[PDB]
């Protein structure tokens, strides 16, 4: 329908809180109309253990997607 306005967050480090407790930081690579996001070089902030080279996050469990860069 309407693609979310994330064309300015491309290839910039962001930190988004999975569900209500987890917080994942990575480099955004793409997104879908459901607000699914694929972010590379993830790191589960808590010491903090990396996730993998390429992860996808279902847009249902995303709450906020604040960006840790110039934007």
């Amino acid at each position: 329908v309407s693609t979310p306005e994330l064309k300015k967050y491309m290839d910039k480090k962001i930190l988004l809180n999975i569900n209500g407790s987890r917080k994942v930081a990575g480099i955004l690579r793409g997104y879908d109309i459901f607000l699914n996001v694929v972010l590379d070089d993830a790191m589960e902030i808590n010491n903090n253990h990396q996730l993998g080279l390429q992860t996808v996050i279902r847009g249902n469990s995303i709450i906020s997607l604040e960006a840790l860069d110039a934007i």
Binding site: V1, I33, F34
Partner: peptide, 16 residues
């Protein structure tokens, strides 16, 4: 075109 599911179909079907 209704819910985004139809649009995602018209992407996945081409992807396969």
């Amino acid at each position: 075109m209704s819910t985004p599911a139809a649009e995602q179909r018209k992407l996945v079907e081409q992807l396969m």
